[PDB]
Symmetry: C3
């Protein structure tokens, strides 16, 4: 498939890479980019050879905002009738893990894109913010929901009311990102993390991702019941027997389940 | 209005300041102070010229506890019949943002007051704790609820079972506060943050605050739906058009919505 | 009672210690150990002289995993019919506080054991991970539920998909543990913390623990109502009068409630 706003590749075995490529717009999220990222991610999710997906931007910007030239003329009814941002919501239904590799600006919709991914690997140059209020709006893709759950009320209120950014260091300290690495090492780290995930059991990876997502949907008691049911069900798989037998036999597992 | 336990002022444009002023009691929260803070905050919320509110104590204490001389004689039925602490609950219904500027002791009800605010700016001298257990009670104003949500179970259990305090540094590290600054810079930082918020769109500020509060009331899926509806509705406002147009025209926005 | 996988003691006044003792297995959690820890904890909970419980392993391992030799042959129906891990769930019903004192490896079920406790005191040597995916399974004792609630999605996804460990330092930074101390000081710190808790009001300790646990079961509004009811009820106790009177009289309280 040919894309106009992104570049896709398979840079290492088992990993699909989606690189945002609107450099004139600092990778601002527009409607085309939304559809193209969703399409690419769905193709990677359907590809048996791929175990994990990486989303990244440029050295300068993961994504600096949603595209404001596109949003300025929007009305409430048009936003609702077009189901605006629903493509990004659909991205949360991809079953394989998605690793955001964030360099430079991840602002507004770009911060929200990083937060909707499963892991975030941040360059030391990464800056995370929700400056929607400065434009007379509020976040619409989880900047008030996923951010608050990750970093707490006091930091979420500061970001979303003042427009300030967090540095990568601060973001890691308060739970927004998985890891920080030097900027020159960002893509290598993200590809290595993604390949490690891709070498793991496929059904176990899906189960982990599903269960962590479910942690935000239920009270703890019900989440524990959900996780316990998922755990029992893993014992139905070939990969469970192989993984545990390999451990006990001090050898590498050969996972085969789809 | 004349107050007996607080001092109110408008120190910079767009900002209302509430300073707790019971120095003999280290600003312990009594019934009078509760009613006076609520009254002052409601007046600032109704004042069109004000965009944000700051609550602060003295250099020595934001508030060291609820007033124990007042609580010692309390019975369960009197506490329930008087709706004790309901004024502080009402403070959560103020629509404009509230910034807590915390120096020195914020203990017990004082820590809870900081946590019920939207942002917390802490002096490096700030100390946060919930020593209710040492008095034979437990927190009654969110010291087990807002604290746990901010800092996690292990730190909340430590504070509320052992009576220890967190330093400002520790509090920031685990998500209890928005920012730390040197003690001499605390009021300047809080007033600057509050004025920045007051320069933002009024309906967008209310929407941000409401949506972040809603993050603690719903599972993520339903919170995302709530936030998406709020986002669509912002496109109904003059401030959205002005904010986005100003961005695109590389100029300062002139927000006008009430 | 004689135990085969643990050693129990009363090392300081008011504290019951449970030491995991399967050194050949690095304290891996098997069925026997589960039942023995539950039994010991229930005995300490019923002992009027005990105010807090400490669970610890060896210098090398708090617990390195669930016992894989035992799980390798498990089927989904046998896991469900045996109510596997239900003993650990029952441990959450112990009313007195439980302090995990973690040195060295706390992996898999061992990390989950630390997270199900109320406080975690970590040696600087502590390592926390959920490497279940490497065995073809997922966590079944809260490694996707309690971990996510403590540290956030990005870190929980990293741990549970990549199998990496957090250092004690990292774990404290993101909210997984209460305190870090040098390895040589771990048991002293944990016993001192536990004795401090044991010197507090018994009903107030139970109420604190219950309310913090309830923070994960309800939306904030309902959690605040729960906590407010619990607070009113504390004024029914002798310990509340004694604790507050002692404060006001600048003396040590003599708590007596059971
Ligand atoms: Na099996
Ligand atoms: Na519009
Ligand atoms: Na009483």
């Amino acid at each position: 498939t040919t894309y106009t706003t992104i570049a896709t590749s398979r840079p290492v075995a088992g990993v699909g890479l989606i690189r945002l490529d609107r450099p004139d717009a600092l990778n601002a999220l527009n409607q085309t980019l939304e559809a193209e990222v969703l399409d690419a991610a769905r193709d990677f999710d359907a590809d048996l050879e791929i175990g994990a997906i990486v989303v990244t931007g440029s050295e300068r910007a993961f994504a600096a905002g949603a595209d404001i030239a596109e949003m300025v003329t929007l009305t409430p009814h048009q936003a609702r009738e077009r189901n605006l941002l629903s493509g990004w919501d659909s991205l949360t239904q991809v079953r394989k893990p998605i690793v955001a590799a964030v360099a430079g600006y991840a602002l507004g919709g770009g911060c929200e894109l990083a937060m909707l991914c499963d892991l975030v690997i941040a360059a030391d140059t990464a800056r995370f913010g929700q400056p929607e209020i400065t434009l007379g709006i509020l976040p619409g893709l989880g900047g008030t929901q996923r951010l608050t759950r990750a970093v707490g009320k006091a930091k979420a209120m500061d970001l979303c009311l003042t427009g300030r950014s967090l540095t990568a260091e601060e973001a890691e300290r308060v739970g927004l990102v998985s890891r920080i690495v030097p900027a020159a090492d960002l893509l290598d780290e993200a590809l290595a993390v993604a390949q490690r995930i891709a070498r793991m059991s496929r059904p176990a990876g899906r189960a982990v991702k599903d269960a962590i997502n479910e942690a935000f949907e239920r009270p703890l008691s019900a989440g524990m019941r959900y996780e316990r049911d998922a755990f029992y069900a893993m014992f139905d798989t070939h990969d469970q027997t192989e993984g545990m037998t390999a451990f006990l036999e001090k050898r590498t597992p050969e996972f085969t389940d789809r």
